[model samples]
Target: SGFRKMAFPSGKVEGCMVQVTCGTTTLNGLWLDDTVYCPRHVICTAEDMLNPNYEDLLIRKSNHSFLVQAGNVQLRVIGHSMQNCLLRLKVDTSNPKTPKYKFVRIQPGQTFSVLACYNGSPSGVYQCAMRPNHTIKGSFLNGSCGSVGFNIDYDCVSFCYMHHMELPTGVHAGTDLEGKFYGPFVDRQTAQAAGTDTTITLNVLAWLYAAVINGDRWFLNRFTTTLNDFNLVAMKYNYEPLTQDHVDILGPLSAQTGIAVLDMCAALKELLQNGMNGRTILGAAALEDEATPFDVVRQCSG
Candidate 1:
């Protein structure tokens, strides 16, 4: 009635349990009381549940099938019944056998699949796969296991923001231009009414900000008109200007370091400069003839 081992596989049927083996790995089922205990255990912590190194052990237990789908410059690793296990994914060159695997983690059960961006190399011709860790085990009936593979040859770099145009020309530019157009790109009335023609106007804010930094009155005027309108609204509403007393009350209450408006502006400008250094954006291209906002701003400010 308590704890004892039995032979013959069915004498009393109390201590009879099944066993599963994969190559050199063998798991014995333990029978306790009336419960059938299969080999199961915590394969990895929740943080490492998506490690590919532990994928085989994870799927071997549950016999669950996994899939790898490629799109543009991204790869999707789909999990079927991958619970209580750690799996890892790796991106390798032509040789899958090579040990040098640039791997990343994927969360299981949260979603059917995990998408991984390939930085921006545009080389979709890489090999990707997942595997389980063998260091963990337990006694419970889980799902099944399977794996999938496919070759990819797609352009993943040509994304949304890069292709966005400030204005769509001709009758071809209609409802279909929603995601494509940079600004509202409708009409002057729409731009002014919605006030989306500044930052949303396809690099307009970047250009104007750059011009202001460079002391270029020509380009700055366009943005200042919008700013002037905004200021007028604030004035009409009788928005109170902050005094030293107000700053003392709010600064301490907000727990923010005291700073001057010009100092904050300078800090913001520096942040923008540092942030844009190694990144590519629509407004940061061909900055020679003021083509890029960053260069234009730097030149004027310098």
Candidate 2:
């Protein structure tokens, strides 16, 4: 028995729940609003529950990502800016069949930023890592490779605390969606519209197209939160497996956020449906096979 010390209280307190909605293009599930108080005058409902009985609970965040899970509570924030924000994942990390958890795959050679947050009681911490935006100035021909790092800061949280602010005064954390690239040839529509056959149009168009595609791939990275980066909505596609269903939900979000969503969703569907061709699992895997019966549950995380 790993059970340790337990200082039991003789009385029980009223329980309340808060709902924290995601930012803009997409909003995470609603969180309990702690600002509102009831007869007991409790400020933080969830925090209060654990304060007295905290000896038995293990409060931990992930080592590599912004996903956080507390027993039945789980949250996930997608994008580079969500670096230190706390949230749980919809899927269990132990499941190898699920999406590979690499904290978010950034282009190995590209410079990126990481946002750090502080959750210290009576205060909060928020800091960021930044790098200079790079310029690619080579002819759009065959192959290319390069690597770069930004004005990287390791202990961003400490910087936030020293300033005594949730967010720094003049610090910026937003990027526009106009000129970034998302992905390429993911769908026919994106390909055909990328350029014209005229003299230099094709080459210029191809390069711009690449930028758009790359931008789509890093939609989360472009904005502080997914909602802020794109206009989004959740939809369900029952034509495939559970993982496919999740993609279906993302498809709608992508579509609303940008034209790139269409291509991305199509690409995602192709990838998942292709991979899930005929694999068979006994119990749990079988259960996670489709989204038709209940699509709403498809967006759940670990």
Candidate 3:
């Protein structure tokens, strides 16, 4: 009945189970019902699973290989194969290390993984309570964690409406030539569009926003053009504006290119704290209804 554990890779008979171990040379095996049989010839030694270098195979029953690869705001579980059983998981993000204890569920899938984001809620990892009737375990860490230029009036700051969505390169006189702003470089187009202008374009949005904050004035009166400043600092993905709670989490290292990341740190805090009116001014400033030409828009310590 429960005697021989042979290879199922053994056409049922001779179907013995396999044991694997590393480090300190310990052996752990699985169970095989009754499809296979392995006497002495098949194998009967835990020594077969010992680590070649005689090292300590991680602690007993340790789940140390669980990871969450991170993105700008989203955390995903991919690139790994987990064909175990149905998992009962309730992520504990409120406290990465001290997760809650209340897990219970029975879904079917493979490889353990999850998804989440740091879009609005501070650096908050809402702890979970998984009172799994079958004793839950383990935790979730914040993903496998893995610039600028300038000007004033004649050149202020500028960037796309959102992060990564930059604007087209402005020719000395392109249709969108709203004057010299900073970010992603004005002639930041491909050689076909910018013709050999291979300059380092800073895609950091905040820096551009900073240069613009103190660099406006119905700015240019030289031509029949006005400036086009963008206030991406106020908005995140979608119309959702950012809050100080969120800011406190990202901190200094979460910067942009050119002169904005650090440039707008304090300035932005005050600006975001302004509430509704701040959005009002941000929107109010982007229009070129007057017509002439213009453009323009942070940091940390050691």
Candidate 4:
């Protein structure tokens, strides 16, 4: 009867089974009519499953010295270290029992970003810390002296949506992943070498589309901030703005106007040309058109 307050739908079915998970453990089986009946090896008390210590767990893992920033439905973890270090990130608030963990290796003098997705809205707390290479375990590191806490928003779905849109459509080929994939562009070895920045630009567009779909200010602002950064990089490389053809190819991002309208190879060629022309792809003036992703970013952020 106490399960009534568990915030989930529970009822009896003739041949139904139930599975519940918390933190890193799971409970699965039938729910018998008897009040004393329980799942295999699982015991229950009225107070059990009613309380969780997320704050204590978060405090023990987060690194305060490290900088935490929000991305498009993701979190970017920055470590201030002159030497390469291993970073451990954990999400505790989303699913207390099945907390998520991500380990990112931060290169010396470089900022590392981790993409995290939470299903339970803005209630999750993230904790991160750095560890020396020697102290790292098989996949995670040991030691939790200096950790920082990062709060979650009501939604972590935007970045996930973007990632799925750009999901490596390429299938595994003979020792290599090859094929024309979905989203803003394609990634090939040749493209990776010759036009890495352009490839990034395409991926940005993919995220922009996802942001539009999710319709969140966080992701929109994040997208705009990134575009500004990309603008700087473009100026440094003498990149030009997008062409009318490129804009047309981008079309309207919707189920009806699939991303395939934009040809990865052709767009890349023009993108490089625009870059060569010393024009950046996104800016106040460049985004004057409401149809542009730049415009969308500004509109959503505002």
Candidate 5:
């Protein structure tokens, strides 16, 4: 069972005898039964599984144990019901008085543990609901847990994008080339491709139809190309121009990359939402002959 609970429908065990009367039942099983099932079963559905949760884990810093080893990082919480199954991670390492290492909702089965790393850093603890919120707890006091530790030595500093550039020497007879670049830097190629003169001006329109209001980024990223002045933002795996073949690929890849995981927050309001089998519905969604927001595409790739 990937996201939603799977029912055996009162059937067999080895071939679990599940009894189905009228309505469908849910049976939460493993990968082994996927083939025996409708060939559409997933091992750990979105509800059953948790995300890697750690963001930017790739930027390893120099001379440090960039997570040289990982232990208990695979801890999981069992969800009995979607409501009770939601989780919140907390860390108490900051306060020395009460060095509590584990906490759980008990009713919902939400829990946490000491995921080990190089120097026994305590800041890695985090809270995860099937949703995202500004409310983290502990010393940060902001309602969230974990302050983004420095185990890997990477800089979390933000950088400003280059807004403008100057032409090579002698272009304008060498007095002084001082031209201000306008907002939303759109280059010639995109402008030409999009059939517009001021590509930067295209931003106003790009924000309009950058695909649906769907917050699903993996779905978005694969479906379009986004341009900003001179930079290129093509869909990572080409979900744009949604084809029968590419549509087939979106399900599992989206599940693996946590696209559906990223979307869990949006569904929590309705008894929570959460992935699944590698089954491709073939023509799951009808193929289209148009382009989508390029940003949706790039986010999937990188």
Candidate 6:
């Protein structure tokens, strides 16, 4: 099969497996390129099998923040632009452990964008910025106080596993991780590189990150305002215990804005790495220890 522009699919359909690739150096995602009879995207090999069944999954092109769900698979596009993979995390409030959260590893490569750090612990919003071509560390150093609503931390500097002193995202208003200031906000144009290897992580208790390959606008705002401004729909999600193994594809999200689509194989793969090599190339998500097994899943609606 020849290479084609990979976009999301609308209705449900069955198709053969395809090898996907995205990123400057990173490129690979299982998106339904429903253009051809086969929706052949680049390497449409007969090796993989994608068969996702859904009724009428739709999102209008008006919302500010975009979130789409089929099962327990939740993804949010909070950023206005799609550049690179900006990470998100999910918190399991039931966990007894202090600051226990799940990382929603999504869109790999030069796709997806993040302008603000969306928090869901208490439903709060904070503006985060970064220079287009420059590397952003952290700013807006707020002093320590009490519970800022949710618990978020990242390993931007190192593994951040040192004495529990992880790099902050600046979105932390109370700012007291190392018993001082924890600015948990740092952003950049390309998730490509600030260093040969760089990263920022947190639990997305606020927004759900959906890898649109990129999509609409109305879906984003409606999803955002409701999840924030008004009713914080108490969404119950079941995450995979999250084991790190196969990273066959580095999820290729779309550009700025367009018709957003979710692939059956993509969600199937991301959920069950036990499937195909191409299907389960999930990125850096660690939802171990709190979530129920992946077999049982659910979604949020309000």
Give all candidates' CA lDDT scores: 0.23, 0.22, 0.21, 0.24, 0.19, 0.19
Best by TM-score: 4
Candidate 3's C-alpha runs over 4 A off are 1-260, 278-302
In Å, residue 9's CA in model 1 sits off its true spot by: 62
**TM-score of every prediction relative to native:** 0.19, 0.15, 0.15, 0.21, 0.13, 0.17
lDDT of 3 by residue, 77-102 (tens): 12221111111111222223221111
Can you write out model 5's per-residue Cα lDDT over 134-214, one digit (the tens) per residue?
111112321111111101112221110111111122111000001111222221112211111211212111222222223
Q: Runs in model 1 with CA error above 4 Å?
A: 1-64, 69-203, 212-216, 220-228, 231-302
Output the better candidate (5/6) by TM-score. 6
Report clashes for each candidate as comma-separated counts.
31, 38, 60, 19, 42, 42
Q: What lDDT does model 2 reach?
A: 0.22
- lDDT tens digits, residues 1-302, model 1? 11111111111221122232333333322122222122122233333323333455465543222222222222222222322221222222122222211112221100011111121112111121111110001111221111101111131111111110112111111111012222233211122222211111112223334433333322111112232333343344332222334223323212222333223223323333343455323234322111222222223332
Residue-level lDDT for 155 in candidate 5: 22
Q: How many residue pairs of model 4 clash at the backbone?
A: 19
Pairwise TM-score winner, candidates 1 and 6: 1
Q: Candidate 6, which ten residues in sequence have the lowest lDDT sum?
A: 157-166
Score residue 239 of candidate 6 by CA lDDT. Answer: 24
Better model by lDDT, 1 or 6? 1
lDDT per residue as tens, model 4, 197-292:
222243334334534344321212211222344445545543434344444534555332233423322333333335324333332112111133
- Encode model 6's per-residue lDDT on 1-302: one tens digit a residue: 11111211211111111111211111111112221010111111122213211111111122222322212333332322111111111212211212222222222111111111111111122212122222222232211111121113341111110011113232212111122212222221112222221211111110112322212111222111211211112111222111111111111211122221122223322333332333211122432111111101111111
- The TM-score between candidate 2 and the true structure equals 0.15
Off by over 4 Å in 4: 1-202, 207-260, 263-265, 284-302
| Higher-TM-score candidate of 4 and 5 | 4
